[PDB]
Structure 1
Amino acid sequence: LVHVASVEKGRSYEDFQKVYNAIALKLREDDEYDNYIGYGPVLVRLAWHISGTWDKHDNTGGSYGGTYRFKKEFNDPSNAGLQNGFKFLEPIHKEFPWISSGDLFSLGGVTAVQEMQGPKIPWRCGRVDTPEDTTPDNGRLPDADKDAGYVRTFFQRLNMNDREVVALMGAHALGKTHLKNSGYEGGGANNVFTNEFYLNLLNEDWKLEKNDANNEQWDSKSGYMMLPTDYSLIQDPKYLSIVKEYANDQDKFFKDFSKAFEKLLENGITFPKDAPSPFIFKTLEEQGL
């Protein structure tokens, strides 16, 4: 199964920078969402969940086909809450109806990371919408109640190694868990992209508690929250070494996250030899906007 990137007809860097800007201006405008976290975190989660259905063995799933727009996939229990991200992106899609759905969902994640002061994430266009029967079945996204060996095995399906897993998990600095979406609650209100997930794992006094949905989670007196899968990164000695590395080197963590996140959003896609180079979008702040 081969998915060849096909550039929206006649479009170039400037067209996609205009879409980036419209998403970034809306992120700034719609600041009240989720008790003033804003939409950045949910857009990052959306871009990960539309990409994380990929299976390297048969190239099913993945961001290319924009299949989250179909009911089977937007109703996946693992996607509960992401409808907020989709509704945020709807006026963007209306303004720029030429962008494919996979390009819009993945660019929403890139734009959110950068506007939250994260690394620059190179991004490539050319995902093409595919039909409803290409939508992957539910059940391909990971469970959060599991241990390190589950996480390691899970990510092998996405062709990610230990460093790529630990880097990608640093996005759990952002936003929060919501009991009604996932059965986990808490985590505060953070909307600045930093390496604080790793510092919190190493420095907080974690207690294993049960939440109001009767699921276990790790909580600190300070109000920080880790899922069992997050905590597994300090239980397994190979992950722990990488958590310490990122806790001690902000720049290394940004560069490794950028590479892993781009790879995640590009899994499954064949880029022709003469495809454009990846775009690196300017932030609103860099543009004086």
Structure 2
Amino acid sequence: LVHVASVEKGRSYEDFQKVYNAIALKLREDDEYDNYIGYGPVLVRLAWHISGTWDKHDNTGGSYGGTYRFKKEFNDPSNAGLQNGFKFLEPIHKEFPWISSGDLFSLGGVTAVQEMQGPKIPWRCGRVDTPEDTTPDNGRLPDADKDAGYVRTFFQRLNMNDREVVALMGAHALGKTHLKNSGYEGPWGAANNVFTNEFYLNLLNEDWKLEKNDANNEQWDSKSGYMMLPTDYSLIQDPKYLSIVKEYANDQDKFFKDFSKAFEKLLENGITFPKDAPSPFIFKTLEEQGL
């Protein structure tokens, strides 16, 4: 497979900045979702799950085709709870019917990180909707009940190295786990709709206790009322991952710079960009525009 990026016919930077502004205004407005966390966290989880199906060996999956819109991927057990993010974006797609599904789903993730005071993420347009038979089969997204060796091996399929894996996992400062979606329950931290290096500081400074939860799954719980998945706690059990966790815990700016690069790479895997194509767009926040 080759997937060539094709700009939506006749659209420029200003068009995409209007879709970003529509998503960001609705993030502001629907602030009550999930006990006042807001939709920002489920939207960056949606952008990672539609990208995370990519396989570097045959170029299948990834964000390009927008195939989450199809039943098979939509109903994947690993995507439980993402229907909420889909439903959020659906009025925005009726307002801007020209944008492709993969461009809308990935842009939702970018808009959410930046509106939650995160780093600017360069974003490229050009994903093209592909047919229902290009939809990847279920089972390509990662399990949470595993160790550092599984994590390393998993992310190799998306050719992410150690630094990129640790930077990307820092998005778990956002939102929370929900028992009915995944068999896990609880937040990773206190400031869960502000993008900060809090995940790393919690992993290094809390007194974590291994416990079983109500779904019979294990998770690491702290006195503070926070939790960590087996795969998160893996990052301090592996010596290579632990030196990077310490780095980001001591330097949020380095975490932001590395997260920015790794998240753009994740959203663009599998896509070939012609050099006639526009450079990556840097969108302004509502705040920068006075809106």
TM-score surpassing 0.5?
Answer: yes
TM superposition shift of 1:287: 0.7
Provide the rounded CA distance (Å) in 2 between the counterparts of 1:223 and 1:277.
44
**What are the Cα deviations for residues 99-141 of structure 1, in whole angstroms up to 9, with x where unaligned?**
0000000000000000000000000000000000000000000
Contact 1:175/1:188 (8 A) holds in 2: no
Count of aligned pairs between the two proteins: 289
Deviates more, 1:35-44 or 1:186-195: 186-195
TM superposition shift of 1:36: 0.4
Provide the rounded CA distance (Å) in 2 between the counterparts of 1:98 and 1:188.
39
Identity of aligned residues (%): 100
Contact 1:176/1:188 (8 A) holds in 2: no
Contact 2:173/2:191 (8 A) holds in 1: no
Asked if 1:219 is matched to 2:218, the reply is: no
Provide the rounded CA distance (Å) in 2 between the counterparts of 1:100 and 1:215.
38
Contact 1:20/1:108 (8 A) holds in 2: yes
Contact 1:198/1:244 (8 A) holds in 2: yes
Provide the rounded CA distance (Å) in 2 between the counterparts of 1:9 and 1:273.
17
TM superposition shift of 1:22: 0.1
TM superposition shift of 1:189: 6.6
Q: TM-score, normalised by structure 2?
A: 0.99
TM superposition shift of 1:286: 0.8
TM superposition shift of 1:190: 1.0
Contact 1:100/1:129 (8 A) holds in 2: yes
3-state SS of paired residue (2:255): helix
3-state SS of paired residue (1:188): coil
**What are the Cα deviations for residues 18-60 of structure 1, in whole angstroms up to 9, with x where unaligned?**
0000000000000000000000000000000000000000000
Contact 2:103/2:125 (8 A) holds in 1: yes
Provide the rounded CA distance (Å) in 1 between the counterparts of 2:222 and 2:287.
35
Contact 1:43/1:112 (8 A) holds in 2: yes
Which residue is equivalent to 1:29?
A: 29
Contact 2:203/2:236 (8 A) holds in 1: yes
**What are the Cα deviations for residues 261-285 of structure 1, in whole angstroms up to 9, with x where unaligned?**
0000000000001100000000001
Provide the rounded CA distance (Å) in 2 between the counterparts of 1:194 and 1:4.
34
Provide the rounded CA distance (Å) in 2 between the counterparts of 1:123 and 1:209.
40
Provide the rounded CA distance (Å) in 1 between the counterparts of 2:83 and 2:160.
27
Question: After the TM superposition, which residues 109-258 of structure 1 pair with which residues of structure 2 at under 5 Å, given as runs?
Answer: 109-186=109-186, 190-258=192-260
Provide the rounded CA distance (Å) in 2 between the counterparts of 1:172 and 1:225.
11
Which residue is equivalent to 1:91?
A: 91
Contact 2:146/2:231 (8 A) holds in 1: yes
- Gaps of at least 5 residues in structure 1 are none
TM superposition shift of 1:188: 5.7
TM superposition shift of 1:222: 0.3
- Gaps of at least 5 residues in structure 2 are none
Deviates more, 1:149-158 or 1:182-191: 182-191
Deviates more, 1:109-118 or 1:181-190: 181-190
TM superposition shift of 1:223: 1.0
Contact 1:41/1:175 (8 A) holds in 2: yes
3-state SS of paired residue (2:191): strand
Deviates more, 1:187-196 or 1:88-97: 187-196
Provide the rounded CA distance (Å) in 2 between the counterparts of 1:288 and 1:202.
38
TM superposition shift of 1:229: 0.1
TM superposition shift of 1:224: 1.1
**What are the Cα deviations for residues 120-166 of structure 1, in whole angstroms up to 9, with x where unaligned?**
00000000000000000000000000000000000000010000000
**What are the Cα deviations for residues 68-105 of structure 1, in whole angstroms up to 9, with x where unaligned?**
00000010000000000000000000000000000000
Contact 1:43/1:109 (8 A) holds in 2: yes
Q: TM-score, normalised by structure 1?
A: 0.99
Provide the rounded CA distance (Å) in 2 between the counterparts of 1:193 and 1:127.
27
Which residue is equivalent to 2:279?
A: 277
Provide the rounded CA distance (Å) in 1 between the counterparts of 2:37 and 2:75.
24
3-state SS of paired residue (2:97): coil
**What are the Cα deviations for residues 163-207 of structure 1, in whole angstroms up to 9, with x where unaligned?**
000000000000000000000000667100000000000000000
